[PDB]
Design a protein around this ligand. Structure first.
Ligand code: CYC
Ligand code: CYC
Ligand code: CYC
Ligand code: CYC
Ligand code: CYC
Ligand code: CYC
Ligand code: CYC
Ligand code: CYC
Ligand code: CYC
Ligand code: CYC
Ligand code: CYC
Lengths: 213, 172, 162, 162, 172, 162, 172, 172, 162
């Protein structure tokens, strides 16, 4: 509804042209229309798992059978396919329970758009939309952004645009945040403590009598 | 996103021991007070938009410099940022009342509100008043009996007054 | 985790709207189900020692080679049988967790995620724990509606193994 | 449309999994709620001609200028008052629809989607139908738990107008 | 995605009249048979993986040329395509049983199955036979009383046999 | 499929450039490797009936229960043992395929894709075919040259089973 | 993407039998002619840009209307589209020569070229002539011995003349 | 991604002079030890999955608190993190052995591992110990001669023990 | 940079799998190619002062105006001819780099990336260095397989200029 918070963009490796003509350490950025085979589509369906979830969370239970079938059929465009993984409640429990709203901006830019966030003030800018539009509505506004649709195009798996000397993003950003880790240490269940006996100590009634002489 | 039930589960989980009978008895009481929890949550969302506008007028009277020019909530665009975001406290409060736990309230609506304002210039003090003006009206809406059966829920309404006080004191 | 209270919450979050009567009716359905499910959890916690002794001995009589074959994966040595009662002692916790939570949340988050992932590596056959749970399915001794409630989570774990 | 049966269905569809006990408990919450909601719909369908006569006359006495001011948007002419009973006669259908469906589906799909979109164009003030529904909220004559349940869909429409 | 309720709603919307009394009398009966509907749906998903493997062996015996070389389900990969996709019939059937309507079954699992096989080259008849195999075992799983209260599920059972017969005849 | 000729092709396709000397040197690495490999495939095709007889009997002596336990999954009946020589007769084809192709293409496309997917369902323990291949690894009779190249594909299949 | 090897593999997979002896005798011959295959492929990409410009001038002389205003290759932008493309035939031809199979040529550079032109207005004859002007020069570049050892590759060069004739006749 | 060759190239590019004679004498030795490099790398990937499980059991015995509840590797999802991940050290180590340089090891598997753990809570020291349990078994797998020709590769195996020690000491 | 060793590495990285026999055969294609390529680099490093003297004088006789026309871009003054031997002295380094590396990596990373980008700005005609390299192509004096290996990188640079 309301137009977005105006954010200043910083200098970033993809924001400009760079005259690298295809370097080797650059990704293999895949396309659906090349395949014509059983064979090619299994590799292409694996690299999109490797982008949006991460290698560590690429286990079989999480994977969706219906979505994989669609790509082979070709009924759904790969850009329409990534919407399945971002609005998947198997994905949603792993990342939305554990990450705050401002980290949820940063993780979606870092994976889906394949770009670093510019500044801090633009994760604030995208934040209002997510709370009101939901997680699905913020993802929907990110994939239908003009920036995403022009540069990745219609059928090309997400990837990092320019990384001349830049950290891989899967390695760079943890699935969960530094905040949610501190809760895990707080509910560690320390052993032999005085704190777990505090709720038992108040239930016991003690009467004390003092004599003065 | 945690419950009262999964609060006990994740606490019993760390130990690696099955939940005790006494703990279970406590959860059987939450089943008995479960229908009163739907009484209080349904009464807020029915009066949701009426309590946003009513707490807004009492805020913008008693701090007149906000909608005055130069104020942080002056123009019609920011003003809608503040007016409509007063639902977002109530969106995440009534989540926590129906959850019975403050975990959903903490990692969405509490984890960065005191963060985001230094970069924004929105005053911290103003927020404390506004949510605290919701609390005495949200408790007062759920308190009065009109066309419902009479019961006792003072041990449950104090959870709601704790939830707004958790939301207030984490910002200001 | 997944709970039909929080299932109503996370569904209303993506639409960005208040808790209407659609999400509210999902709560009561969880509430009155607990009264047939909490004493379904009390039937398992009271009989804790019985079932992990029963299911472990049921595995050895079903598969007699798993006590004789030399290997870490098997139960030939003592530390295998010490790891035997640890594993089925770990299954009965999550079933009592998922009965008390009222959903398949703890079964999802703590047991079956990556369960088919590890068993390919450590060559633990899943049909071992199939017969282990099927002994618990017949020996629980629960009765009535509550028993049915404790019966689905056993069968939900079996279909996740296979 | 949105129904806490189909809310359980569409949630289990995106995960690509079977109907576990998480989605199943959302069904019986809808089922036993209908028995306090179907005779909540019978209280409105029997009193159909009372309320649309009552709410229309309540609007004119609340806003006395809407009968006098010349304009298509107002109720000065006869076809305005003919369009008056059409509009509030259209509100009571969806409330009886959303009571019978048990969710806010028909209120979403048929009434409030684009409801704030049209009222800016035809300069129909939403506070007209606020006082119209508040007369129905006080004079529907329903009693008991069923009446209370219905009471929410009236208040859910009011918050959508404002 | 339609219900039995929203079937009546969208039908009553087209005529533009209020909901008639006998339609509410019929839907009140669906409330009474609502608990039997959860009896039948819970029994299938508990026996979901057991009825996929059991219907697969009876299919691949009685048509041996499939897993024989040159067959459409010969190699391990394709074999997993069919074996695991036999759940997808059951995924969308038990959706339709709990919905009580065949609208969810039609636009997901029925709308292009007879379409997709000509390009694919999979035999339509073989798939149809497999669906039939599931039906006499899925009805037989929900039929027998063991540890449940005696009840008449004949009316409910027929709908399930109609749903597989809808799924079978739309392909072969 | 994957072949270090086509590995050089599909890599140069995504960059949209001609076959430079980078992709060209990957070809002659495949070419002179075939001399060892082709002979290495001739050692398996000549000894076809020996190894599938040898590995099947090696499985029964390693796991003596698989001949006695009643079940379709096992080899108690005759059609189990008929399906026994079919399975290990199917493994030796792909190893001779992947030796001749010179890459792990046919092992990827025809054997190990979904191999851990089916074995959870039909409760076929992968450690059965581990001991089956390890008999072929010790008794194929090829030493040096192509055999070393030939052996890797036996060990590449074992790590895919586990 | 298929080889000569995986051509035999996928053909022997469909019959489901082991690889026969004469097939291994035929593939052993491909090993012996493998070094001549790198002789021919390396000679084209060294003369890649020289044969694009040389075939372009012979095309745009003998059809002068393309160059002339109103033509399909008139403006400097489209002209680079066609000029840039003539490498893309050669990119996918020399893939197929080094592959020894026409599968990579078919599903990338042949599968939609006769498709894409009806919507584009590019004439068929111009494309066909250009490919056929590459073929007599690409064969002539690999034919002549200067500083290489003399061998016989007429059974191999005819594969290259077949690949351009496959690329030509599928469009015009 | 750098080689031993492109290590010398990028070093000789910075001085801007031609490649000296002894550098070509040293690189000619890498050609002679090139066939010993292939065998060692090939052997590791043949024993890849066997050395992941074997180093995992020796880790989770000697630190039992990890798979004990409350531990960082307690649950299966986390556990399938620490176990599968152990391939990713071996994936980037055997890249560096076949490269003969530690540049590929540094910017993928070393550049943020000591970074990512403070936010994760995983113990860095425990991970380091696990990699050091890989090293004495990976060296021992490539050491023993069974069915290979005898040679000397102690000057080459020490590069592999350096690569794990580079991977270990950069984290713990 | 691009090397058919690292070409095998970066391809196996995106699939997230171990170095199979597909990537391994790309290594020995690079290895035995070096023995016909390292003395192909020794033929250029020994003749370093011959070729940069030869190609520079070959440019002036081909284009006689480039010694007479007044401009910074040309070789009329002394610092132009000092920048003449710097440029072709810079070409022969990368050819010896890309022969030793065995791929077109250093030709990609150090010479031809942005080579058509700068020549539009400084109006350096690329046909100047075409005739410069073609003198080196005929005057190298290499014979046998090594000559063929040193001949492609000269022709790979020419097609990058045009
Ligand atoms: C209200 C009492 C005071 C106030 C509110 C106000 N805030 C903004 C701008 C933002 N508010 C947020 C808040 C949240 N984002 C979240 O994700 C959540 C939890 C779900 C919350 C509570 C954010 C991110 C912004 C930045 C912009 C945005 O809307 O997306 C404004 C607008 C200010 C502006 O536009 O510059 C206003 C008016 N400010 C006041 O004046 C009151 C004191
Ligand atoms: C999800 C849909 C749903 C709702 C909304 C619901 C509410 C609900 N509240 C009830 C009771 C009640 N609810 C209240 C609530 C309160 N009384 C006060 O004075 C307090 C201010 C307030 C709490 C803050 C009380 C006191 C009772 C008495 C009966 C009982 O203990 O349940 C009951 C008991 C049964 C009945 O009334 O027929 C129902 C039905 N039941 C449902 O199925
Ligand atoms: C909290 C939930 C949870 C469970 C249950 C769990 C089980 C589990 N059991 C394991 C091994 C094992 N599991 C067993 C158990 C058995 N093997 C037998 O022979 C018997 C038939 C059977 C017991 C009845 C044994 C003996 C091992 C060690 C096998 C080995 O080391 O190879 C392993 C791999 C190694 C390990 O860390 O110890 C896991 C992950 N992990 C989990 O996170
Ligand atoms: C099915 C649910 C449904 C409803 C209820 C509905 C109402 C609705 N009433 C409208 C206009 C109107 N609504 C009214 C009604 C009133 N104005 C008055 O003066 C009285 C106070 C009041 C009646 C009590 C009148 C007179 C118009 C015509 C106004 C105009 O043409 O500008 C319009 C815009 C024009 C139109 O198509 O006729 C809509 C969309 N639309 C819907 O889809
Ligand atoms: C008679 C024994 C038998 C079975 C069971 C069988 C099934 C079968 N389904 C296939 C494909 C498929 N099957 C589906 C089915 C669906 N995908 C969805 O998302 C929908 C919900 C659902 C339909 C409602 C799809 C989408 C494909 C893709 C490939 C194709 O078009 O065939 C294929 C293609 C080849 C392969 O998978 O190896 C097989 C084998 N083939 C057999 O020989
Ligand atoms: C073989 C044919 C057959 C069926 C299918 C059958 C079902 C069946 N389920 C019943 C009850 C019931 N069934 C359920 C089941 C559930 N409620 C929930 O909320 C849960 C989600 C779910 C279990 C997972 C419940 C709660 C009852 C209540 C009555 C009872 O305890 O039996 C009864 C009691 C008698 C009646 O309903 O008339 C019948 C008949 N009886 C038959 O003869
Ligand atoms: C081309 C590659 C390929 C292989 C190898 C393959 C194996 C394969 N073996 C199967 C069953 C089987 N596999 C076996 C084999 C064994 N069971 C035992 O008891 C022994 C331990 C062991 C042999 C040493 C048996 C007996 C069956 C039938 C089991 C059943 O029907 O339940 C099945 C499922 C049913 C079938 O179609 O026959 C597959 C898919 N499929 C493939 O596409
Ligand atoms: C990429 C696929 C591939 C591999 C794996 C490969 C390995 C390989 N290692 C070889 C030799 C060899 N490899 C070794 C290696 C060693 N000996 C020891 O005792 C040491 C412990 C160890 C080094 C640490 C030795 C000593 C030889 C002797 C022959 C030679 O110098 O190449 C040869 C020579 C030709 C042959 O064996 O037929 C091959 C093929 N060739 C290939 O094409
Ligand atoms: C005009 C028709 C014609 C052709 C095409 C031809 C090619 C040709 N290339 C040969 C050799 C060869 N060709 C190559 C080429 C290469 N090896 C590689 O690994 C590199 C990537 C590539 C160069 C870039 C090699 C390495 C040899 C080895 C024998 C020799 O030195 O000639 C030979 C030697 C004699 C023979 O093979 O029978 C022939 C015939 N001879 C002819 O009469
Ligand atoms: C390519 C280089 C690379 C590495 C190595 C890497 C590691 C890495 N490991 C992670 C989590 C993890 N890492 C581990 C591993 C361990 N935890 C334990 O308990 C054990 C002590 C230890 C293994 C020995 C586990 C179990 C998780 C999941 C933890 C969680 O989900 O919170 C995460 C965050 C979530 C993820 O995507 O999976 C990263 C980014 N990322 C990279 O990009
Ligand atoms: C490491 C590989 C490498 C090379 C070879 C290279 C060449 C190169 N030569 C340049 C200019 C130049 N190049 C030349 C060379 C020539 N002009 C002539 O008249 C003669 C025909 C010819 C020499 C035979 C001259 C005279 C300039 C200066 C032109 C100017 O300043 O406008 C420039 C632009 C300005 C500069 O920084 O000096 C580059 C980038 N750059 C590189 O990075």
């Amino acid at each position: 509804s309301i137009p977005l918070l105006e954010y200043k963009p910083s200098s970033q490796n993809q924001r400009v042209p760079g005259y690298e003509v295809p370097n080797e350490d650059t990704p293999r950025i895949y396309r659906i229309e090349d395949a014509a085979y059983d064979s090619e589509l299994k590799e292409l369906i694996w690299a999109t798992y490797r982008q949006v979830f991460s290698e560590h969370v690429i286990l079989k239970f999480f994977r969706q059978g219906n979505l994989e079938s669609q790509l082979k059929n070709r009924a759904i465009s790969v850009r329409d396919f990534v919407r399945g993984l971002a609005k998947s409640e198997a994905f949603k429990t792993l990342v939305i329970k554990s990450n705050s709203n401002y980290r949820l901006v940063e993780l979606a830019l870092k994976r889906l758009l394949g770009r670093a966030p510019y500044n801090k003030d633009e994760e604030i800018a995208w934040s209002i939309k997510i709370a009101t539009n939901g997680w699905d509505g913020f993802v929907d506004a990110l994939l239908d952004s003009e920036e995403y649709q022009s540069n990745f195009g219609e059928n090309i798996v997400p990837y990092q645009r320019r990384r001349y000397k830049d950290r891989p993003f899967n390695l760079v950003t943890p699935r969960y945040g530094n905040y949610w880790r501190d809760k895990l240490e707080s509910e560690r269940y320390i052993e032999g403590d005085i704190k777990n006996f505090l709720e038992l100590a108040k239930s016991i009634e003690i009467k004390t009598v003092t004599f003065t002489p | 996103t945690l419950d009262v039930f999964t609060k006990v589960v994740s606490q019993a989980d760390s130990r690696g021991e099955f939940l005790s009978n006494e703990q279970l008895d406590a959860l059987a009481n939450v089943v008995k007070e479960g229908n009163k929890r739907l009484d209080v949550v349904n009464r807020i969302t029915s009066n949701a938009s009426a309590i946003v506008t009513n707490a807004a007028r009492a805020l913008f009277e008693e701090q007149p410099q906000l909608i005055a020019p130069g104020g942080n909530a002056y123009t019609n665009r920011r003003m809608a940022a503040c007016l409509r975001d007063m639902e977002i406290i109530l969106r995440y409060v009534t989540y926590a009342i129906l959850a019975g736990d403050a975990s959903v309230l903490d990692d969405r609506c509490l984890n960065g509100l005191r963060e985001t304002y230094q970069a924004l210039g929105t005053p911290g003090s103003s927020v404390a008043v506004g949510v605290q003006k919701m609390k005495d009206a949200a408790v007062g809406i759920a308190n009065d009996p009109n066309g419902i059966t009479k019961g006792d829920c003072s041990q449950l309404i104090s959870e709601v007054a704790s939830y707004f006080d958790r939301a207030a004191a984490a910002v200001g | 985790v997944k709970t039909p209270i929080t299932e109503a919450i996370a569904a209303a979050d993506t639409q960005g709207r208040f808790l209407g009567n659609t999400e509210l009716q999902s709560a009561r359905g969880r509430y009155e189900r607990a009264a047939a499910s909490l004493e379904a959890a009390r039937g398992l916690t009271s009989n804790a020692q019985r079932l992990i002794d029963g299911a472990t001995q049921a595995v050895y009589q079903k598969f007699p080679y798993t006590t004789q074959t030399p290997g870490p994966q098997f139960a030939a040595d003592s530390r295998g049988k010490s790891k035997c009662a640890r594993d089925v002692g770990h299954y009965l916790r999550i079933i009592t967790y998922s009965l008390v939570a009222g959903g398949t949340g703890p079964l999802d988050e703590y047991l079956i995620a990556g369960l088919a992932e590890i068993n390919s590596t450590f060559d633990l056959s899943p049909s071992w724990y199939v017969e282990a749970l099927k002994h618990i399915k017949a020996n629980h001794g629960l009765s009535g509606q509550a028993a049915n409630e404790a019966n689905t989570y056993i069968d939900y774990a079996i279909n996740a193994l296979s």
